[PDB]
C-alpha cells in the first residue's frame, strides 16, 4: 500500500452552534506537528481495509478556521526517514443554499394515511450541509426522516451542490393545520441556518 | 430540572438602552424555539421576541419592532434581549421562557423589572 | 392585537365553569396551537392545556381545553377557592407571532 496522508474539516455541527470544533489529521497508508497551533494541545489514539492508520485532533481552533487561517499537519512516523505534507482552510467561492419545502402531493392526501414532505437545499458552495425538520415547535429526531447526500448538481459555470431530506407525517396532522419545518444548517447562512415553514393554509 | 434565571433589570432613562439576560441550565437553549414574555404592572401577559431553534432566526412583536434584538451565546447557554429607544410603555417584568412541542410557554424564568423613568 | 378573552368570570364552589377566547382564521382557526396559562398573584405564568386539549405535567383533570372554530375554551369542573388565578389563552399566529388573551380574573364566590 502507498504511504498517504489527508485532512479533514471541523464539524459543521460544532462550527454553526458556536463552540469548540476539531479539526481531524489522519495517515491512511508517531508524533505530529501543526502549523496554526499556539499550544493547541494535540491528542492521538490507538492506530487501527485495517491497513496502517493513525489519528491526532487538534482543538479549540474554531476562530482561526472562520478567518480562514490554512492549517498544515505534518506527521514523522518510523517507516520512511522524512515527513509527509497536508493543507486544508475554510473554502473561498461560498454561496448560501436556496431552502424550499414542498407540501405533499394531491394523491397522498386522498389516501389519508402518511403524507410525505419534500425538503431541497440547492445552489450551495462548499458540500457541508445539515439538515434538520420542526413539527411545530418540536424538533423530530434524526431517525424519524430520510436525508440523502450532498451531491454535486449540473452547471458549465460555477460549482454548487445540492441535498434532499424527506419527513412522513400523518394525513391527520397534516389537515389538523400542524406547522412543518426543514432547516437547513450551512457557512455561508449569514444566520447559520435558513428555516422555511409549511401548512395546508398555503 | 430546567431552570432559567432572568438578569439585567433595573432603572433606564427613557431613550436610554438596557441588555437584559437568561442563563438556562438542565437543557440546551441553542436545541429549542427560545421567547421573551413581558407584563407590564397590573396589565397583561404581552410576547415580545422569539428565536428559532440553532440559528438566529428572530421574530419581534410589532410594539418592540426595530428597538428590542434576541440572541443566544451558546457557549455559556444564555439568551438575552437588546432593548434600545425605551419608553415608559416599555415598564415591565420580562421573562425567558422555554416553548416546548406545540407554541406552549412549557418553563418560565422568575423574571426581571425594567423599570424606564426620568 | 389581542385575542378576546372576558375580563372576569365568577363561579360557586364545586360548579362548572368556562373562559373563551376569541381568535381568527390567523391563529386559533384551522390550528390547534392553543395554549392556557394560569397566573397566581406575585407569581410568573404556569402552562396548563396546550394542543388546544392536552393537561400540563400534574394539572388535574378538572381542567379541560377545547376548540371551534376560531375560538377556544378552557373548562373547570368541581370549582374550588385554590383556582382564584388570571387565565391567558395564547395561540401561534401565520406571523410567527404567539398571541396572548387579555387575561380573565377567576372569583370564587361564598
Known amino acids: 500500500c502507498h504511504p498517504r496522508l489527508s485532512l479533514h474539516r471541523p464539524a459543521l455541527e460544532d462550527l454553526l452552534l458556536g463552540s469548540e470544533a476539531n479539526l481531524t489529521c489522519t495517515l491512511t497508508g508517531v508524533t505530529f506537528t501543526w502549523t496554526p497551533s499556539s499550544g493547541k494541545s494535540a491528542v492521538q489514539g490507538p492506530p487501527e481495509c485495517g491497513c496502517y492508520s493513525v489519528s491526532s485532533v487538534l482543538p479549540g481552533c474554531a476562530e482561526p478556521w472562520n478567518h480562514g487561517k490554512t492549517f498544515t499537519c505534518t506527521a514523522a512516523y518510523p517507516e520512511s526517514k522524512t515527513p509527509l505534507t497536508a493543507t486544508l482552510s475554510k473554502s473561498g467561492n461560498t454561496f448560501r443554499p436556496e431552502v424550499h419545502l414542498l407540501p405533499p402531493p394531491s394523491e397522498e392526501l386522498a389516501l389519508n394515511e402518511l403524507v410525505t414532505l419534500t425538503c431541497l437545499a440547492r445552489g450551495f458552495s462548499p458540500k457541508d450541509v445539515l439538515v434538520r425538520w420542526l413539527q411545530g415547535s418540536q424538533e423530530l429526531p434524526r431517525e424519524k426522516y430520510l436525508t440523502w447526500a450532498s451531491r454535486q448538481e449540473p452547471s458549465q459555470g460555477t460549482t454548487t451542490f445540492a441535498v434532499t431530506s424527506i419527513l412522513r407525517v400523518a394525513a391527520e396532522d397534516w389537515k389538523k393545520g400542524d406547522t412543518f419545518s426543514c432547516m437547513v444548517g450551512h457557512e455561508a447562512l449569514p444566520l447559520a441556518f435558513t428555516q422555511k415553514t409549511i401548512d395546508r393554509l398555503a | 430540572e430546567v431552570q432559567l434565571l432572568e438578569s439585567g433589570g433595573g432603572l433606564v432613562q427613557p431613550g436610554g438602552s438596557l441588555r437584559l439576560s437568561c442563563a438556562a441550565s438542565?437543557?440546551?437553549?441553542?436545541?429549542?424555539?427560545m421567547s421573551w414574555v413581558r407584563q407590564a404592572p397590573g396589565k397583561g401577559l404581552e410576547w415580545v421576541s422569539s428565536?428559532?431553534?440553532?440559528?438566529?432566526?428572530?421574530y419581534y412583536a410589532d410594539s418592540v419592532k426595530g428597538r428590542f434584538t434576541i440572541s443566544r451565546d451558546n457557549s455559556k447557554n444564555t439568551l438575552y434581549l437588546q432593548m434600545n429607544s425605551l419608553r415608559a410603555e416599555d415598564t415591565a417584568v420580562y421573562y425567558c421562557?422555554?416553548?416546548?412541542?406545540?407554541?406552549?410557554?412549557?418553563?418560565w424564568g422568575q423574571g426581571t423589572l425594567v423599570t424606564v423613568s426620568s | 392585537s389581542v385575542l378576546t378573552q372576558p375580563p372576569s368570570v365568577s363561579g360557586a364552589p364545586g360548579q362548572r365553569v368556562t373562559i373563551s377566547c376569541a381568535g381568527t382564521?390567523?391563529?386559533?382557526?384551522?390550528?390547534?396551537?392553543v395554549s392556557w396559562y394560569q397566573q397566581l398573584p406575585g407569581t410568573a405564568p404556569k402552562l396548563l392545556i396546550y394542543?388546544?386539549?392536552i393537561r400540563a405535567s400534574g394539572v388535574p383533570d378538572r381542567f379541560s381545553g377545547s376548540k371551534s372554530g376560531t375560538s377556544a375554551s378552557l373548562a373547570i369542573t368541581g370549582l374550588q377557592a385554590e383556582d382564584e388565578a388570571d387565565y391567558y389563552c395564547?395561540?401561534?399566529?401565520?406571523?410567527?407571532?404567539?398571541?396572548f388573551g387579555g387575561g380573565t380574573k377567576l372569583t370564587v364566590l361564598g
Open positions: 421562557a422555554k416553548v416546548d412541542s406545540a407554541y406552549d410557554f412549557g418553563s
Open positions: 438542565g437543557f440546551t437553549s441553542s436545541n429549542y424555539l
Open positions: 428565536i428559532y431553534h440553532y440559528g438566529h432566526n428572530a
Open positions: 382564521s390567523s391563529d386559533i382557526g384551522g390550528r390547534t396551537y
Open positions: 394542543k388546544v386539549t
Open positions: 395564547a395561540s401561534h399566529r401565520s406571523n410567527n407571532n404567539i398571541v
